[PDB]
Design a protein around this nucleic acid. Structure first.
Ligand SMILES: [Mg+2]
Ligand SMILES: [Mg+2]
Ligand SMILES: [Mg+2]
Ligand SMILES: [Mg+2]
Ligand SMILES: [Mg+2]
Ligand SMILES: [Mg+2]
Ligand SMILES: [Mg+2]
Ligand SMILES: [Mg+2]
Ligand SMILES: [Mg+2]
Lengths: 124, 222, 256
RNA sequence: UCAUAAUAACUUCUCGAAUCGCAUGGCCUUGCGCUGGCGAUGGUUCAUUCAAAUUUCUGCCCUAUCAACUUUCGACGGCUGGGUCUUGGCCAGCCAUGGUGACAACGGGUAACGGAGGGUUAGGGCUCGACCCCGGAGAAGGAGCCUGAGAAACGGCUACUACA
RNA sequence: AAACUGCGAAUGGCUCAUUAAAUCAGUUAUAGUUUAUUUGAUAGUACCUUACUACAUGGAUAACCGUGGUAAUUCUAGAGCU
């Protein structure tokens, strides 16, 4: 939208234990619906002099009546730290990791139960 | 009446079926572990001695040796019993078992060659299956090739070439990594155990010496 | 069959943990060690529910066994190690040391010690006997066994044990006029001065404790913890172990 | 008669490491010589932890159209032993005649699991509590048992009855 | 990978059939006991057996190869190793 998106940061803390920085991000976006997770990430990256792959955000809940969203933002010191620390479900949604394709939960359990009737190398 | 003949020396296995029981007549009242001549089975079996090793009745129930009964019985088996595979720690199960006395009402009987005859049965003596080498313990290697205490066991290891995954690469060999062999690591571990043991030795004695020192000076001033 | 329990219910968890009631059905269960479980404090609660580093179960589990948290200078990879009283928690990655001391509300607080208070601990003498070889030995409140204590440490004394060798620097005798902290009962986290000691044969002797505001109290020697002979040997949390009523607590907020 | 120490002996003589990884470094009689840390698993005793198991005092709804109950074959107790992780009529032998009850024993009913608690009440109360928590018991109905620190386990086994 | 070994499977979940000094509740004791796990300590011993050795002892068994049985089970046997 024509009106600028205002960035805010509260509860900022430096956490070298996971090699990241934790904070809560506030958005002031009047006269527009909301901001996507993607465009939120570059704005954080350009504010913290980091890259898109340096930044991940968890959950954006828009405040009642619009014009404001809040959420938890996570920026990392190194890209390797993000890959080693950020959970796999977060990696697949942001796009730089492949989903671990696997069968259905019931089918895997049924697949396992058939194995219990087999012994030795006959299983494979 | 199918017979499963085994040849322990050559590791040969073949099944031959006999439709006429009169050649099995001398086998009727025998017992598991009995060495029996196979003259009626001949004439290709002349000069051959067979040992009874068990058999299955017409219902597939195995023979458990030591059960003196020509019929089927139910026993409470356990971990070490010879016809039960316990799937749980301490679990016991009652299973049908055929007695050790061989005879009629039997499907397959297991045999073993005891003494070689002057014949060549196709499938038993004609084939000499190589033994699945080989020894893995250090002393077992030492006794097998007759080494000495100061010989290098590290090089007397049985090889087996393996063909790579059709890539045209150079084939290599696997080896039975020898266990219970002396390494500097094992000697270092033995050195470390005594090193830790000795370290505790002065620590307790100096604290015992120390605690005596305070008591000595405490009583003097008291 | 019958055996020890392995789960814990969130509703039945100790109150001083200050756990969210709607977060889940279960609560962390301490394994064993610096107990009693009533009261103690799991490592996960200390790092997740007090520092949020460590936001949920996965991250705190990663932190625990990256070998970055030293309880009393010792590496602990137990996600639910029972951190207890006077225990020193160290995070070299951020470079600070924490100590667990009860506040007036009766709950463990995030107390900070800078550089030198992490070199020792105060422990309460629970047992003195003769060892396997006629060797006198001493047991503290944190299961620490000392194989050679001073002969004058009888019972209930507080010994300053060094945190990299286990040796005793000094001890405080349990007598009137010593600075004491109440570690149990209704007066949790209250620091005062021992005034009276009445002996009742039967194992429920009472100790009278006087506060900095001339307030008289009473407690058993199962909850009296000696801190200093003339002045406290450690750094007290904010409030210095003085409990204020609901009115004065509100007034402190309105003024501040 | 504790902690602990000491002596005389004993044992189908327990433990006292024939286990694994990383770093590989020092010394002099240069021998494939002597030494060197961090860990992993495991190990005797003591303490500790999660506990478990018994255990003291007090407290349970209705019923006399339930007034005497227990004790042959344990009922109350004493002694010796066995068994148990341990105490104990827990059990085996010998001796004595005790134990409970109108302050309700014993027996019967419960459409009774106990409690923290729910509903409704000025005070005093009435009623419910299978059920998000603590304790108990059970896994079609009884009994028995192996493994195991921990089970009389049942998504363990064995036997009988019913069902299938 | 398979298999041997170790650990867990005695937690959890479900139900309220039995049960009226019984369970349970508050309060006591274990000086009348056991305890996997965790935590801290903790063991020097010329004791005596093998053909002997400590620069290091012995024999089996899986996995695997091959031969089967029974209509059928998370049934298993015989034979060669390790
Ligand atoms: Mg049960
Ligand atoms: Mg614990
Ligand atoms: Mg110990
Ligand atoms: Mg008697
Ligand atoms: Mg007796
Ligand atoms: Mg009922
Ligand atoms: Mg009902
Ligand atoms: Mg059973
Ligand atoms: Mg349960």
């Amino acid at each position: 939208s024509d009106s600028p998106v205002t960035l805010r940061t509260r509860k900022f803390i430096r956490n070298p234990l996971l090699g990241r920085k934790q904070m809560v991000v506030d958005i002031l976006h009047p006269n527009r619906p909301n901001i996507s997770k993607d465009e939120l990430r570059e704005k954080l990256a350009t504010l913290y002099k980091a890259t898109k792959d340096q930044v991940n955000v968890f959950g954006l809940r828009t405040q009642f009546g619009g014009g404001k969203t809040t959420g938890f933002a996570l920026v990392y010191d190194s890209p390797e730290a993000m890959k080693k620390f950020e959970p796999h479900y977060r990696l697949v949604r942001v796009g730089l990791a492949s989903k671990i394709e696997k069968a259905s939960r019931q089918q895997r359990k049924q697949r396992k139960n058939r194995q219990k009737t087999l012994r030795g190398t006959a299983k494979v | 009446m199918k017979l499963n003949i085994s040849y322990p020396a050559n590791g040969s296995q073949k099944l031959i079926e006999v439709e006429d029981e009169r050649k099995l007549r001398h086998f009727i009242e025998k017992r598991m572990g009995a060495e029996v001549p196979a003259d009626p089975l001949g004439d290709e079996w002349k000069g051959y001695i067979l040992r009874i090793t068990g058999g299955n009745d017409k219902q597939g129930f195995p023979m458990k040796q030591g059960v003196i009964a020509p019929n089927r019985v139910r026993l409470l088996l356990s971990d070490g019993h010879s016809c039960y595979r316990a799937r749980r720690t301490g679990e016991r199960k009652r299973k049908s078992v055929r007695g050790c006395i061989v005879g009629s009402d039997l499907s397959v009987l297991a045999l073993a060659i005891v003494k070689q005859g002057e014949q060549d049965i196709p499938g038993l003596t004609d084939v000499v299956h190589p033994k699945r080498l080989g020894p893995k313990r250090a002393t077992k290697i030492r006794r097998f090739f007759g080494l000495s205490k100061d010989d290098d066991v590290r090089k007397y290891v049985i090889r087996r070439e393996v063909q790579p995954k059709g890539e045209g690469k150079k084939p290599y060999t696997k080896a039975p990594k020898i266990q219970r062999l002396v390494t500097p690591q094992r000697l270092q571990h033995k050195r470390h155990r005594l090193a830790l043991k000795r370290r505790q030795a002065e620590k307790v004695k100096e604290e015992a010496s120390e605690y005596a020192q305070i008591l000595a000076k405490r009583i003097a001033e008291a | 069959g019958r055996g020890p329990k392995k789960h814990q219910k969130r509703l039945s968890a100790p109150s001083h943990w200050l756990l969210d009631k709607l977060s889940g059905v279960y609560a962390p269960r301490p394994s064993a060690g610096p107990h009693k479980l009533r009261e103690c404090m799991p490592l996960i609660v200390f790092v997740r529910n007090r520092l949020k580093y460590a936001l949920n179960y996965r991250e705190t589990k990663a932190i625990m066994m990256q070998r970055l948290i030293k309880v009393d200078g010792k590496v602990r990879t137990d996600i639910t190690y029972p951190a207890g009283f006077m225990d020193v928690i160290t995070i070299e990655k951020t470079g600070e040391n924490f100590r667990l001391i009860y506040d007036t509300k009766g709950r463990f607080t995030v107390h900070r010690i800078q550089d030198e208070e992490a070199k020792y601990k105060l422990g309460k003498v629970k047992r003195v006997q003769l060892g396997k070889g006629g060797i006198p030995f001493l047991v503290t409140h944190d299961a620490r066994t000392i194989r050679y204590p001073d002969p004058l440490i009888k019972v209930n004394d507080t010994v300053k044990i060094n945190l990299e060798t286990g040796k005793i620097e000094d001890f405080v005798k349990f007598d009137t006029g010593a600075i004491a902290m109440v570690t149990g009962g209704r007066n949790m986290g209250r620091v005062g001065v021992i005034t009276h000691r009445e002996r009742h044969d039967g194992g429920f002797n009472i100790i009278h404790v006087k506060d900095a505001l001339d307030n008289t109290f009473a407690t058993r020697e199962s909850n009296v913890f000696v801190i200093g002979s003339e002045k406290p040997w450690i750094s007290l949390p904010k409030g210095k172990g003085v409990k204020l009523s609901i009115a004065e607590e509100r007034d402190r907020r309105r003024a501040n």
